[PDB]
Amino acid sequence: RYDSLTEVEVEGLSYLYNFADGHAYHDINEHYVDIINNLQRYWQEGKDHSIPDMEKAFKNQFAELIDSSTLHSTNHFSVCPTASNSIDIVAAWLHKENKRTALIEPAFDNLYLLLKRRGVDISAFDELALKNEHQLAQIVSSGDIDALFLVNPNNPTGLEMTESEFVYLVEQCKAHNITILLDRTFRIYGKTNFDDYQILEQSGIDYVVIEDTGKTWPTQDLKISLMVYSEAISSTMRLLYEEIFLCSSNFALALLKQFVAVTAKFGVDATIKNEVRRRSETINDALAGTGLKVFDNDEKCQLPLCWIDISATGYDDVSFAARLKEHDIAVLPGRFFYWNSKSQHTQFIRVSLMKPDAEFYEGIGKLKEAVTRILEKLEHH
Amino acid sequence: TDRYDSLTEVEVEGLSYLYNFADGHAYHDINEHYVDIINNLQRYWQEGKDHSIPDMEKAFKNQFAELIDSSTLHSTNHFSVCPTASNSIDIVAAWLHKENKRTALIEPAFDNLYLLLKRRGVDISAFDELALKNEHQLAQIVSSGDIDALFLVNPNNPTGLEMTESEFVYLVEQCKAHNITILLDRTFRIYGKTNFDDYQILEQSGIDYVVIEDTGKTWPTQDLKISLMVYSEAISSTMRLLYEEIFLCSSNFALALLKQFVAVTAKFGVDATIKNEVRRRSETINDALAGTGLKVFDNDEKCQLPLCWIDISATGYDDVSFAARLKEHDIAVLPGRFFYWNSKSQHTQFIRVSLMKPDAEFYEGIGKLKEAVTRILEKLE
Ligand SMILES: CC1=C(O)/C(=C\N=C(/CCCNC(=N)N)C(=O)O)C(COP(=O)(O)O)=CN1
Ligand SMILES: CC1=C(O)/C(=C\N=C(/CCCNC(=N)N)C(=O)O)C(COP(=O)(O)O)=CN1
């Protein structure tokens, strides 16, 4: 039995065709090439500027990309080397302030593990409550919770809140003095475009927002996670941050600031979303007619991953992933995302898209052949 | 608030001052031995792409084992790789709490070691750094039955206290005899004067241990760092579980870049690449403070850390007040009381001045520091 999704992902790192973890590792495209050709420029940029100036410069470049004037305005933020570090500091804050916390389900499981490790009193809430107004109202009205930890858009389902859904969420939390923790790790893949920072700040609620470069720009896990919070909790949030970190890397900030700038210059679609679409189509076309059904609906966004229903095969997720491993292919069994109800959700695997290009395409062809060979060996049984 | 609550808070404030001698992160200029690395950053970007994460983890660990000439470290696969040394300490603290280990922490110590253990809920007691050099005092500590784990820093920051081989062997013998777990922070290892194989001694003894390494105080890579966390076989499963709650991995680019810095240091020697410049800077600040009434902390048993620990008793000023006066002259130093994390009020007579700052800022700032010190003292008379 696996302890966690990360245990599976670590094992996957040793496989020929690794589709387990969702960290961005695709090849540098035509537009980002110039950045690698000029690494020395960003090394020099880091040397020539103060740590506070580089922090603000990256934050503001990101605010320009997502067109949030509210984020551009605020100085209440810190810079972590990883998004999991931002999540963990938030969990330390929730425990310190004694906030009973409802955590979205499904979720990448280390969100639950970090909250649990920090001593947070955790309960589950269905991601679909973000799209059902009175299901959400009952959750926040119960007097059972003081905070709501969500992921938007959500991993692995691509569930994404509309502007009106997000406004309703903030209004309900405001009326019940509920703190919102908002994990925006997959923001750039979303289909929506509204200023969620503006809605949060104008409401007056306490909140933390977590951003991440690591699922989006392929920088070999040299990452930046912005952790942004309301004025009223900034002193304590910053104190907890400083127990761990003095700062992140000025080199990493200068480098990632340019990745963000290039994405702004050529747009999201040409630099990120079109590639995700093409790789999505590759898997869909490969699995057509096999009985494996890619999860899809009208409302979801396209994450850098595919959520696949394998129920037609008669295997559960852990079983099927074990067979694929004998063919040098590593996938993520899906049950762990349903961290409060794993055994009711054993029919899915997750396959990540943003892998090294040659490995990815060769690997999907091997995956199609392995599925074929696995199912035909099952006809002989 | 009006006062300082942590060394990191003072260091953050110091980031905005013209002459910042506060934090101890390596920020000196790239010397002639390292310039070829920066001139060819693309080579290490490419190397990170060309190797799997586990194989680059091992390649860095092995290159470091070569530099420190430890066949034991070279042999072991029980280790994880963190982006910062603070992350490694935090995971160790989480392990101490999970395993219900009453922990004696060295005093003095850089204060976030104390803060992290306290934040994780560890049951903390202080022990005098001088116990490491007095056999009877250490034996009383481990045989009391009041502790289960001993957290030490060797060589110690800010005093430069360093264990001899026979002193280290005695420590391990005594902890073994009382089943005390050793947590060994070797952040400043490369500055020590000794050369023995501590990994061999720990492995041979059979005790439970974690060793923490760091590049950040030694090689100037703009806080793009690597921290090896190496541990005994018997605790490897649980240590790796806690690591994997927070990290999948660190950066392969970071590992490739830092591996070269290590390799070059091993090729040309730690004196030519590191220690010689440290000597020049220590002599520089020693000559500047001579005859001021400020007493540089010194003895014939310490090693030379990249920092200067200074008794300001003769000023009549306490450390925070004196640091406040220097700030008025655009000079940031570290008040020493927070290093005595269990007894701050009894140790207010020291400041710490870091040495490995950008070259022109350092030598110019020592001149400004001498002038500010002279002017502040003349006004008292
Ligand atoms: C919604 C969300 C995630 O899905 C997520 C991570 N997802 C992963 C790999 C996690 C690897 N394991 C770990 N970080 N302990 C995935 O494969 O989708 C993180 C943290 O990102 P970092 O791993 O710290 O860079 C934050 N929010
Ligand atoms: C013995 C030791 C230290 O002295 C130390 C840090 N010393 C510092 C700056 C710490 C800045 N603040 C922080 N990490 N929250 C000094 O100025 O000496 C660390 C952690 O290293 P990192 O800061 O995480 O890179 C581990 N072991």
CSV table of N, CA and C in Angstrom, one decimal, chain A residues 237-342:
chain,number,residue,atom,x,y,z
A,237,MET,N,1.2,36.0,9.2
A,237,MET,CA,1.7,35.2,8.1
A,237,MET,C,3.2,35.5,7.8
A,238,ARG,N,3.6,36.7,7.9
A,238,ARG,CA,5.0,37.0,7.6
A,238,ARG,C,6.0,36.4,8.7
A,239,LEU,N,5.5,36.5,9.9
A,239,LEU,CA,6.3,35.8,11.0
A,239,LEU,C,6.5,34.4,10.8
A,240,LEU,N,5.5,33.6,10.4
A,240,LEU,CA,5.6,32.2,10.1
A,240,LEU,C,6.5,32.0,8.9
A,241,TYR,N,6.4,32.8,7.9
A,241,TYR,CA,7.2,32.7,6.7
A,241,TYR,C,8.7,32.8,7.1
A,242,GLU,N,9.0,33.8,8.0
A,242,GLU,CA,10.4,34.1,8.4
A,242,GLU,C,11.0,33.1,9.3
A,243,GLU,N,10.2,32.2,10.0
A,243,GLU,CA,10.7,31.1,10.8
A,243,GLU,C,11.5,30.2,9.8
A,244,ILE,N,11.0,30.0,8.6
A,244,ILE,CA,11.6,29.1,7.5
A,244,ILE,C,12.6,29.7,6.5
A,245,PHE,N,12.1,30.9,6.0
A,245,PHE,CA,12.9,31.6,5.0
A,245,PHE,C,13.2,33.0,5.3
A,246,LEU,N,14.5,33.4,4.8
A,246,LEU,CA,14.8,34.8,4.7
A,246,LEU,C,14.2,35.4,3.3
A,247,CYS,N,14.3,34.6,2.3
A,247,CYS,CA,14.0,35.0,0.9
A,247,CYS,C,14.1,33.8,0.0
A,248,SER,N,13.6,34.0,-1.2
A,248,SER,CA,13.9,33.0,-2.3
A,248,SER,C,15.0,33.6,-3.1
A,249,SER,N,15.3,33.0,-4.3
A,249,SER,CA,16.5,33.3,-5.1
A,249,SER,C,16.2,34.5,-6.0
A,250,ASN,N,17.1,35.5,-6.0
A,250,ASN,CA,17.0,36.6,-6.9
A,250,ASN,C,17.2,36.1,-8.4
A,251,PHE,N,18.0,35.0,-8.5
A,251,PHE,CA,18.2,34.4,-9.9
A,251,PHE,C,16.9,33.8,-10.4
A,252,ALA,N,16.3,33.1,-9.5
A,252,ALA,CA,15.0,32.4,-9.9
A,252,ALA,C,14.0,33.4,-10.2
A,253,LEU,N,13.9,34.5,-9.4
A,253,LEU,CA,12.9,35.5,-9.6
A,253,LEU,C,13.2,36.2,-11.0
A,254,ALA,N,14.4,36.5,-11.3
A,254,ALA,CA,14.7,37.2,-12.6
A,254,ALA,C,14.4,36.3,-13.7
A,255,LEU,N,14.7,35.0,-13.6
A,255,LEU,CA,14.5,34.0,-14.7
A,255,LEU,C,13.0,33.8,-14.9
A,256,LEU,N,12.2,33.5,-13.8
A,256,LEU,CA,10.8,33.3,-13.9
A,256,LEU,C,10.0,34.5,-14.3
A,257,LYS,N,10.5,35.7,-13.9
A,257,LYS,CA,9.9,37.0,-14.3
A,257,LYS,C,9.9,37.1,-15.8
A,258,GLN,N,11.0,36.6,-16.5
A,258,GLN,CA,11.1,36.7,-17.9
A,258,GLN,C,10.2,35.6,-18.6
A,259,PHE,N,10.1,34.4,-18.0
A,259,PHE,CA,9.1,33.5,-18.5
A,259,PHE,C,7.7,34.1,-18.5
A,260,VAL,N,7.3,34.7,-17.4
A,260,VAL,CA,6.0,35.3,-17.3
A,260,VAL,C,5.9,36.4,-18.3
A,261,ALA,N,6.9,37.3,-18.5
A,261,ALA,CA,6.9,38.3,-19.5
A,261,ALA,C,6.7,37.8,-20.9
A,262,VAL,N,7.4,36.7,-21.2
A,262,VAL,CA,7.3,36.1,-22.6
A,262,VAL,C,5.9,35.6,-22.8
A,263,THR,N,5.3,35.0,-21.7
A,263,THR,CA,3.9,34.5,-21.8
A,263,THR,C,2.9,35.7,-22.1
A,264,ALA,N,3.2,36.8,-21.4
A,264,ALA,CA,2.4,38.0,-21.6
A,264,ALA,C,2.5,38.5,-23.1
A,265,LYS,N,3.8,38.4,-23.6
A,265,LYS,CA,4.0,39.0,-24.9
A,265,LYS,C,3.4,38.2,-26.0
A,266,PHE,N,3.4,36.9,-25.9
A,266,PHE,CA,2.9,36.1,-27.0
A,266,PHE,C,1.5,35.5,-26.7
A,267,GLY,N,1.1,35.6,-25.4
A,267,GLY,CA,-0.2,35.2,-25.0
A,267,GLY,C,-0.2,33.8,-24.4
A,268,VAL,N,-1.1,33.4,-23.6
A,268,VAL,CA,-1.3,32.1,-23.0
A,268,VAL,C,-1.5,30.8,-23.9
A,269,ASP,N,-2.3,31.1,-24.9
A,269,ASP,CA,-2.6,30.1,-25.9
A,269,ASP,C,-1.4,29.7,-26.7
A,270,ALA,N,-0.7,30.6,-27.3
A,270,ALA,CA,0.5,30.2,-28.1
A,270,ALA,C,1.6,29.6,-27.2
A,271,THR,N,1.7,30.1,-26.0
A,271,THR,CA,2.8,29.6,-25.1
A,271,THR,C,2.5,28.5,-24.2
A,272,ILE,N,1.2,28.2,-23.9
A,272,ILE,CA,0.9,27.3,-22.9
A,272,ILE,C,-0.3,26.4,-23.2
A,273,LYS,N,-1.4,27.0,-23.6
A,273,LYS,CA,-2.6,26.3,-23.7
A,273,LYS,C,-2.7,25.4,-24.9
A,274,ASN,N,-2.2,25.9,-26.1
A,274,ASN,CA,-2.2,25.2,-27.3
A,274,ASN,C,-1.5,23.9,-27.1
A,275,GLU,N,-0.3,23.9,-26.5
A,275,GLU,CA,0.5,22.7,-26.3
A,275,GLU,C,-0.3,21.7,-25.4
A,276,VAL,N,-1.0,22.2,-24.4
A,276,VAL,CA,-1.7,21.3,-23.5
A,276,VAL,C,-2.9,20.7,-24.3
A,277,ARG,N,-3.5,21.4,-25.2
A,277,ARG,CA,-4.6,20.9,-26.1
A,277,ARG,C,-4.3,19.7,-27.1
A,278,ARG,N,-3.1,19.9,-27.6
A,278,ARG,CA,-2.4,18.9,-28.5
A,278,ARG,C,-2.1,17.7,-27.8
A,279,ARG,N,-1.5,17.8,-26.6
A,279,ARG,CA,-1.2,16.6,-25.8
A,279,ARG,C,-2.4,15.9,-25.3
A,280,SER,N,-3.4,16.7,-24.9
A,280,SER,CA,-4.7,16.2,-24.5
A,280,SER,C,-5.3,15.3,-25.7
A,281,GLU,N,-5.3,15.9,-26.9
A,281,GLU,CA,-5.8,15.2,-28.1
A,281,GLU,C,-5.1,13.9,-28.3
A,282,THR,N,-3.7,13.9,-28.1
A,282,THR,CA,-2.9,12.7,-28.3
A,282,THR,C,-3.4,11.5,-27.4
A,283,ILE,N,-3.7,11.8,-26.2
A,283,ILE,CA,-4.2,10.7,-25.3
A,283,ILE,C,-5.6,10.3,-25.7
A,284,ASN,N,-6.5,11.3,-26.0
A,284,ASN,CA,-7.9,10.9,-26.3
A,284,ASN,C,-7.9,10.1,-27.6
A,285,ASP,N,-7.1,10.4,-28.6
A,285,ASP,CA,-7.0,9.6,-29.8
A,285,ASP,C,-6.4,8.3,-29.5
A,286,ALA,N,-5.4,8.2,-28.7
A,286,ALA,CA,-4.8,6.9,-28.4
A,286,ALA,C,-5.8,6.0,-27.7
A,287,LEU,N,-6.6,6.5,-26.8
A,287,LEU,CA,-7.5,5.6,-26.0
A,287,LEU,C,-8.9,5.4,-26.6
A,288,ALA,N,-9.2,6.1,-27.7
A,288,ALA,CA,-10.4,5.9,-28.4
A,288,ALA,C,-10.6,4.4,-28.7
A,289,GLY,N,-11.8,3.9,-28.3
A,289,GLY,CA,-12.1,2.5,-28.6
A,289,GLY,C,-11.6,1.4,-27.7
A,290,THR,N,-10.8,1.8,-26.7
A,290,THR,CA,-10.2,0.9,-25.8
A,290,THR,C,-11.1,0.5,-24.6
A,291,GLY,N,-12.1,1.3,-24.3
A,291,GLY,CA,-12.9,1.2,-23.1
A,291,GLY,C,-12.5,2.1,-22.0
A,292,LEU,N,-11.3,2.7,-22.1
A,292,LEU,CA,-10.8,3.7,-21.1
A,292,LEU,C,-11.4,5.0,-21.6
A,293,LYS,N,-12.0,5.8,-20.6
A,293,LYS,CA,-12.8,6.9,-21.0
A,293,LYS,C,-12.2,8.2,-20.3
A,294,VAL,N,-11.7,9.1,-21.1
A,294,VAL,CA,-11.2,10.3,-20.6
A,294,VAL,C,-12.3,11.1,-20.0
A,295,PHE,N,-12.1,11.6,-18.7
A,295,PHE,CA,-13.1,12.4,-18.0
A,295,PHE,C,-13.2,13.7,-18.7
A,296,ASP,N,-14.4,14.1,-19.0
A,296,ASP,CA,-14.7,15.4,-19.8
A,296,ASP,C,-16.1,15.8,-19.5
A,297,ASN,N,-16.3,17.1,-19.6
A,297,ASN,CA,-17.6,17.7,-19.5
A,297,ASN,C,-17.5,19.1,-20.1
A,298,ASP,N,-18.7,19.8,-20.1
A,298,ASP,CA,-18.7,21.2,-20.7
A,298,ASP,C,-18.1,22.2,-19.8
A,299,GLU,N,-18.0,22.1,-18.5
A,299,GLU,CA,-17.7,23.1,-17.6
A,299,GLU,C,-16.2,23.2,-17.3
A,300,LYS,N,-15.5,22.1,-17.4
A,300,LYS,CA,-14.1,22.0,-16.9
A,300,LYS,C,-13.1,22.8,-17.8
A,301,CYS,N,-12.0,23.1,-17.2
A,301,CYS,CA,-10.9,23.6,-18.0
A,301,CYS,C,-9.9,22.5,-18.2
A,302,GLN,N,-9.0,22.7,-19.2
A,302,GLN,CA,-8.0,21.7,-19.5
A,302,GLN,C,-6.7,21.8,-18.7
A,303,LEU,N,-6.6,21.0,-17.7
A,303,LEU,CA,-5.3,20.9,-16.9
A,303,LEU,C,-4.2,20.2,-17.7
A,304,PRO,N,-3.0,20.4,-17.3
A,304,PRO,CA,-1.9,19.7,-17.9
A,304,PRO,C,-1.8,18.2,-17.6
A,305,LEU,N,-3.0,17.6,-17.6
A,305,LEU,CA,-3.2,16.2,-17.2
A,305,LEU,C,-4.5,15.7,-17.7
A,306,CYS,N,-4.6,14.4,-17.8
A,306,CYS,CA,-5.8,13.7,-18.2
A,306,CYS,C,-6.3,12.6,-17.0
A,307,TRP,N,-7.6,12.8,-16.7
A,307,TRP,CA,-8.2,12.0,-15.7
A,307,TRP,C,-9.0,10.9,-16.4
A,308,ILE,N,-8.7,9.6,-16.2
A,308,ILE,CA,-9.1,8.6,-17.1
A,308,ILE,C,-9.9,7.5,-16.3
A,309,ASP,N,-11.1,7.2,-16.7
A,309,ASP,CA,-12.0,6.2,-16.1
A,309,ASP,C,-11.6,4.8,-16.7
A,310,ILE,N,-11.0,3.9,-15.9
A,310,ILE,CA,-10.6,2.6,-16.3
A,310,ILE,C,-11.5,1.5,-15.9
A,311,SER,N,-12.8,1.9,-15.5
A,311,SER,CA,-13.7,0.9,-14.9
A,311,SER,C,-14.1,-0.2,-16.0
A,312,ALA,N,-14.0,0.1,-17.3
A,312,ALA,CA,-14.3,-0.9,-18.3
A,312,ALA,C,-13.4,-2.0,-18.2
A,313,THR,N,-12.1,-1.8,-17.7
A,313,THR,CA,-11.1,-2.9,-17.8
A,313,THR,C,-11.3,-4.0,-16.7
A,314,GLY,N,-12.1,-3.7,-15.7
A,314,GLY,CA,-12.2,-4.6,-14.5
A,314,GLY,C,-11.2,-4.5,-13.5
A,315,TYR,N,-10.1,-3.7,-13.8
A,315,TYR,CA,-9.0,-3.5,-12.8
A,315,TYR,C,-9.4,-2.2,-12.0
A,316,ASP,N,-8.9,-2.2,-10.7
A,316,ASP,CA,-8.9,-0.9,-10.0
A,316,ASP,C,-7.6,-0.2,-10.3
A,317,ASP,N,-7.6,1.1,-9.8
A,317,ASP,CA,-6.5,2.0,-10.3
A,317,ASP,C,-5.1,1.5,-9.9
A,318,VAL,N,-5.0,1.0,-8.7
A,318,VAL,CA,-3.7,0.6,-8.2
A,318,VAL,C,-3.2,-0.7,-8.9
A,319,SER,N,-4.1,-1.6,-9.2
A,319,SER,CA,-3.9,-2.8,-10.1
A,319,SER,C,-3.3,-2.7,-11.5
A,320,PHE,N,-4.1,-1.8,-12.1
A,320,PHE,CA,-3.8,-1.3,-13.5
A,320,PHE,C,-2.5,-0.5,-13.6
A,321,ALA,N,-2.3,0.4,-12.6
A,321,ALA,CA,-1.0,1.1,-12.6
A,321,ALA,C,0.2,0.1,-12.4
A,322,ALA,N,-0.1,-1.0,-11.6
A,322,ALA,CA,0.9,-2.0,-11.3
A,322,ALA,C,1.3,-2.7,-12.6
A,323,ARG,N,0.2,-3.1,-13.4
A,323,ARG,CA,0.5,-3.8,-14.7
A,323,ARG,C,1.2,-2.9,-15.7
A,324,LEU,N,0.9,-1.6,-15.7
A,324,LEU,CA,1.5,-0.7,-16.6
A,324,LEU,C,3.0,-0.5,-16.3
A,325,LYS,N,3.3,-0.5,-15.0
A,325,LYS,CA,4.7,-0.4,-14.5
A,325,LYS,C,5.5,-1.6,-15.1
A,326,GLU,N,5.0,-2.8,-15.2
A,326,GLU,CA,5.7,-3.9,-15.8
A,326,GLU,C,6.0,-3.6,-17.3
A,327,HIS,N,5.4,-2.6,-17.9
A,327,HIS,CA,5.7,-2.2,-19.2
A,327,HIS,C,6.5,-0.8,-19.3
A,328,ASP,N,7.1,-0.5,-18.1
A,328,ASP,CA,7.9,0.7,-18.0
A,328,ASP,C,7.1,2.0,-18.1
A,329,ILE,N,5.8,2.0,-17.7
A,329,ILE,CA,5.0,3.2,-17.8
A,329,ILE,C,4.5,3.4,-16.4
A,330,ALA,N,4.7,4.7,-15.9
A,330,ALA,CA,4.2,5.0,-14.5
A,330,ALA,C,3.0,6.0,-14.7
A,331,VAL,N,1.9,5.7,-14.1
A,331,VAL,CA,0.7,6.6,-14.0
A,331,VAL,C,0.3,6.7,-12.5
A,332,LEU,N,-0.5,7.7,-12.2
A,332,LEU,CA,-1.0,7.9,-10.8
A,332,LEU,C,-2.3,7.2,-10.6
A,333,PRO,N,-2.4,6.3,-9.7
A,333,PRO,CA,-3.8,5.8,-9.3
A,333,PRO,C,-4.5,6.9,-8.7
A,334,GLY,N,-5.8,7.0,-9.0
A,334,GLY,CA,-6.6,8.2,-8.7
A,334,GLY,C,-7.2,8.3,-7.3
A,335,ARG,N,-7.3,7.1,-6.6
A,335,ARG,CA,-8.1,7.1,-5.4
A,335,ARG,C,-7.6,8.1,-4.3
A,336,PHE,N,-6.3,8.4,-4.3
A,336,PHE,CA,-5.7,9.2,-3.3
A,336,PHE,C,-6.2,10.7,-3.4
A,337,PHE,N,-6.6,11.1,-4.6
A,337,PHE,CA,-7.2,12.5,-4.7
A,337,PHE,C,-8.5,12.6,-3.9
A,338,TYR,N,-9.2,11.5,-3.7
A,338,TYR,CA,-10.4,11.5,-2.9
A,338,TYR,C,-10.0,11.1,-1.5
A,339,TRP,N,-9.3,12.1,-0.8
A,339,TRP,CA,-8.5,11.7,0.4
A,339,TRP,C,-9.4,11.4,1.5
A,340,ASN,N,-10.7,11.7,1.5
A,340,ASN,CA,-11.6,11.3,2.6
A,340,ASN,C,-12.5,10.2,2.2
A,341,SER,N,-12.4,9.6,1.0
A,341,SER,CA,-13.3,8.6,0.6
A,341,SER,C,-12.7,7.7,-0.5
A,342,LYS,N,-11.4,7.3,-0.3
A,342,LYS,CA,-10.6,6.7,-1.4
A,342,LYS,C,-11.3,5.5,-2.0
